[PDB]
Amino acid sequence: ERALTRFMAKTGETQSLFKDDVSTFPLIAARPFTIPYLTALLPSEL
């Protein structure tokens, strides 16, 4: 899960808690959904 999240934060838009911090603690940037209840409330494993 660390390898997956670092790969997805490196190949997309990224945020950072610190100034210019991409190597250590990269955050996947928050994207808005057009319909947010569908990705919130719905179960994915069923």
Binding site: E1, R2, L4, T5, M8, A9, Q15, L17, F18, K19, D21, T24, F25, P26, L27, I28, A29, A30, R31, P32, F33, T34, I35, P36, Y37, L38, T39, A40, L41, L42, P43, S44, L46
Partner: protein
């Protein structure tokens, strides 16, 4: 007896809606009212209308002249230099009273044509046909139109009527009072792929001649008010209830399995409310609509309820099942006693709110147990005594100012603060519990059945209100029905707890007289505080002595201070016998801590919560420990936990640890004992012997027998050790060492709880347990030791906080790919990043929370991010962040988010009236006065929130920071 304030009586109303345009956010329609004048020379007829453009008005098919003016659009003039809040509160009360339909007034004044005066003097019918149009509504109808392309049913666009109390004037012209009952005919011409849900029963659904639109015809023969009429138009998935067949559930598309699981309990709520009362459900159908961007979490109209979709959960979601269950239950309680039996004035609202809350508490008692009922009643009572000692008091049933200790007028529901409205409903249901305490529960249910039976004999007549006003309850009618069924009148109890607006404060201390074998209690009241009042009635006290539990009634007159009650033997210390408890059982007690000369083990002043009180009793610490261990009352165990924080002796640690180890204790007592044990452990550092508190207990209860540091794989099927397991590290993280830093034995334990978490085997989700793990990681953060204001960079990070930061980065990024149920881990990680920023660990930058507070995110993420931005602009005194928040209050699409931003900026204000701040300009005073005056003119809840914000920031007088 009900006499109308209006000079006409409304019989029937037709509401027809055409052309609901979702692209342009526009409706067109007409309204046809059927009034009978009661006074001759009626001349003007005054109706209520907001935001509707009135095209033409015809009275009896004759063209009539109307004039429209709304004084509540701009309450005070723009060119008045007044800036105090008492001026605005009086002007706002006068403006709301000038559009009040509970007086004779109204906003739209229609003039009767001259040729109909001979039709109006001898009192004959008038049919008023207004046709109107909502061009782009800012209130009333909320259009949720997503920005996916496709047809409006393919993208999920819907409309619903939002607002509270009398807010039906916001989408059609009506007489928007709860006392003007009429029968209804509702037609809605919607798209062919959409469904229109409203009040009444659907008599037919005809197509249009192009078959592209269809008209839904509803009819409501039970006479309801205009304020109880609602509307929900959308591409809803219909589900008929498989148990009760007049109940249809509507959800948004792709949410049908969640709707099936969520609304599967509701037939038991129906069966409960129809067997404690003996009336059946009065309406012929019931409709539950689940929508997006809701105003309130649950709204109840006539034969209809509108919930938000955020209540919909699946079968594997726990910690959300009881909350959604009780939202459904209180919507049904308001169906019985807010919509069928309505209000006669704005006074007598406490009757309806109290009956709704009281029967919902009876439902909670039967469903979740008497212990959950007692815990709920105690938390509501603590809520009201905190609010009434904080600011003035809540006055149920005022007489028309009656309450001048508080910055708004209580004459109208739309001038009340929202916290006052919440505490109003809370105090109303507690006073109804008090009336049940004086007059027994079966007589209380007989009162409610008599009210419902008068209303249902009234509901079938056709006479235009000769008998339709028996569906309206008043205070005098409620007290008269109580006196009819019981023969006792409650006028002292009504005079004390309704008409008087205060709670009581009790300070008790005892002394045991060994010579005369008596117990001398000393109970004194604080009646000079601003929120308090003086109690002179009787008072129950329960004393547990060695011979058992005995109740005593004390008469606490004004001049009373010492109350001598008699005590029993101590012959159960001579022989070892079991000491009998409050219930019929008896237990073995360790009497080594007890005094040798006194038999009494503990004392409880007012155990049954029979007054609205706050007790401060001074027992000895062993009496609090005996009351924690051996009591058979959960409120006494909770108050002993609350009082053991002042006694950090190791006997109290043993008492709380024995409570924590004990199944067959109520689980919410053990969840409190965790935090009490954490506080006691923090206070007896440099005395604590072994490991940190609750760690060995966690490894004994929830970890493997062969591996102590590996947690067991998650099986959450017990629901009491699940709650205790997810609350114990959160309290364990509040442990601190002699250096005021969280120990690295508890932080390592929490991180090993996070690493070894395996949830592939239980039938329930893990989102709340993992979110509580992030909360436990956030609790361990102590303030960093910055030297010379050193910039917080990545190299000079704490070695403890780097692990925490790695874990919350991993959790937030994994939430971006595999999301939780309601983004609970996003909310917990944003809260933890704000915790790390509040100490000197992460740079104090609001850009992350400002990106999570955009419109397209889920609403829980939005309110967590906005809470972080409000905390930032309080601590960093940011001007541009406060302007960002005020701009977001002015123009945000979701009005619940605007109300929540005003609420959070009131609770955590950027400055108070005492503070000198850089953000005390004349510019900010002018902005907030413009936000009270104009700007919030469309919601009635944003305007009261702006009044609350102006009161919190600048006070009741003239803003000081001004020329």
């Amino acid at each position: 007896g009900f006499e109308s304030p209006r000079p006409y009586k409304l019989t029937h109303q037709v509401v027809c809606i055409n052309n609901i345009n979702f692209q342009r956010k526009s409706v067109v329609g007409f309204v046809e009212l059927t009034i009978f004048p009661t006074v001759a020379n009626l001349n003007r007829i005054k109706l209520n209308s907001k935001q509707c453009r009135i095209y033409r008005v015809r009275i009896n098919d004759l063209e009539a002249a109307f004039i429209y003016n709304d004084p509540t659009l701009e309450v005070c003039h723009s060119e008045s230099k007044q800036r105090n809040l008492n001026y605005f509160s009086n002007a706002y009360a006068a403006a709301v009273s000038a559009v009040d339909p509970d007086a004779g007034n109204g906003e739209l004044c229609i003039k009767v044509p001259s040729e109909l005066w001979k039709h109006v003097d001898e009192l004959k019918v008038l049919k008023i046909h207004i046709n109107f149009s909502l061009d782009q509504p800012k209130g009333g109808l909320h259009f949720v139109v997503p920005s996916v392309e496709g047809s409006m049913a393919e993208r999920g666009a819907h409309v619903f009527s939002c607002g509270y109390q009398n807010s039906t004037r916001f989408w059609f012209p009506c007489v928007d009072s709860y006392s003007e009952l009429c029968t209804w005919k509702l037609e809605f011409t919607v798209d062919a792929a959409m469904v229109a849900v409203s009040n009444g029963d659907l008599v037919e659904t005809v197509y249009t001649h192009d078959m592209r639109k269809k008209t839904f015809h509803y009819m409501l023969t039970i006479p309801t008010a205009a304020s109880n009429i609602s509307l929900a138009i959308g591409p809803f998935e219909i589900l008929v209830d498989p148990y009760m067949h007049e109940v249809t559930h509507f959800c948004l598309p792709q949410l049908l399995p969640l709707l099936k699981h969520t609304t599967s309990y509701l037939h038991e709520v129906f069966e409960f409310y129809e067997e404690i009362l003996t009336c059946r459900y009065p309406y012929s159908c019931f409709k539950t609509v689940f929508i997006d961007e809701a105003y309130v979490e649950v709204a109840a109209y006539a034969s209809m309820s509108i919930f938000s979709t955020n209540l919909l959960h699946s079968a594997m979601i726990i910690d959300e099942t009881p909350l959604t269950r009780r939202c459904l239950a209180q919507s049904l309680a308001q169906q019985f006693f807010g919509c069928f039996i309505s209000r006669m004035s704005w006074s007598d609202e406490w009757v309806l709110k109290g009956i709704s809350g009281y029967i919902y508490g009876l439902w909670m008692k039967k469903t979740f147990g008497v212990n959950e009922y007692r815990h709920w009643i105690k938390e509501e009572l603590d809520k009201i005594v905190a609010y009434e000692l904080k600011t003035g008091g809540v006055l149920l049933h005022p007489i028309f100012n009656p309450a001048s200790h508080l910055h708004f007028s209580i004459k109208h529901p739309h001038t009340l603060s929202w916290e006052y409205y919440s505490m109003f409903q809370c105090k109303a249901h507690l006073v109804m519990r008090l009336i049940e305490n004086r007059i027994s529960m079966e007589f209380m249910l007989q009162v409610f059945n008599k009210l419902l039976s008068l209303a249902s004999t009234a509901s079938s007549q056709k006479f235009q209100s000769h008998m339709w006003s028996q569906m309206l309850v008043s205070t005098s009618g409620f007290l008269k029905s109580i006196s009819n069924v019981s023969g006792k009148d409650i006028q002292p109890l009504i005079k004390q707890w309704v008409d008087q607006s205060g709670v009581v404060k009790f300070y008790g201390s005892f002394a045991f007289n060994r010579k005369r074998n008596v117990l001398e209690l000393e109970i004194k009241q604080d009646y000079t505080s601003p929120g308090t009042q003086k109690y002179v009635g009787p008072l129950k006290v329960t004393v547990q002595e060695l011979d058992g539990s005995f109740n005593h009634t004390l008469q606490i007159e004004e001049n009373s201070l010492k109350h001598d009650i008699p005590c029993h033997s101590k012959s159960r210390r001579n022989k070892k016998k079991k000491i009998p408890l409050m219930n019929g059982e008896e237990v073995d007690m360790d009497l080594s801590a007890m005094d040798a000369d006194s038999p009494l083990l503990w004392i409880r002043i007012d155990p049954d919560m029979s007054v609205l009180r706050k007790v401060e009793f001074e027992q000895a610490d062993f009496m609090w420990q005996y009351q924690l261990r051996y009591e058979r009352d959960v409120v006494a165990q909770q108050e002993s936990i609350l009082a053991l924080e002042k006694f950090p002796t190791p006997a109290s640690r043993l008492a709380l640890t024995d409570i924590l180890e004990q199944e067959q204790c109520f689980y919410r007592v053990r969840m409190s004992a965790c935090f009490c044990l954490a506080k006691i452990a923090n206070s007896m550092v440099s005395t604590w012997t072994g490991p940190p508190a609750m760690k060995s207990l966690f490894t004994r209860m929830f970890c493997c027998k062969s591996c102590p540091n590996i947690v067991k794989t998650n099986n959450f099927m017990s629901f009491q050790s699940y709650f205790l397991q997810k609350t114990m590290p959160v309290a364990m993280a509040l442990l601190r060492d002699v250096h005021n830093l969280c120990p690295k034995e508890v932080l390592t334990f929490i991180l090993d709880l996070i690493k070894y978490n395996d949830n592939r085997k239980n039938k329930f989700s893990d989102n709340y347990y993992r979110a509580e793990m992030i909360d436990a990681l956030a609790n361990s953060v102590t303030p960093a030791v910055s030297v010379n204001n050193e910039v917080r960079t990545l190299d000079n990070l704490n070695p403890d906080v780097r692990l925490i930061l790695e874990e919350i980065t991993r959790f937030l990024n994994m939430e971006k790919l595999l999301p939780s149920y309601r983004h609970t881990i996003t909310v917990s990680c944003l809260r933890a990043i704000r915790v790390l920023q509040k100490n000197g660990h992460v740079p104090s930058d609001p850009a992350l929370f400002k990106s999570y507070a955009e419109y397209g995110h889920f609403v829980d993420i939005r309110i967590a991010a906005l809470e972080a931005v409000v905390d930032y602009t309080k601590v960093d005194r940011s001007y541009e962040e406060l302007q960002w928040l005020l701009n977001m209050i002015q123009n945000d699409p979701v009005p619940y988010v605007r109300h929540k931003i005003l609420n959070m900026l009131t609770k955590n204000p950027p400055f108070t009236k005492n503070m000198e701040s850089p953000l005390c300009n004349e510019a900010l005073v002018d902005q907030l006065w413009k936000l009270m005056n104009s700007g919030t003119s469309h919601d009635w809840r944003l305007r009261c929130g702006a009044v609350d914000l102006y009161f919190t920031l600048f006070g009741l007088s003239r803003p000081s920071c001004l020329p």
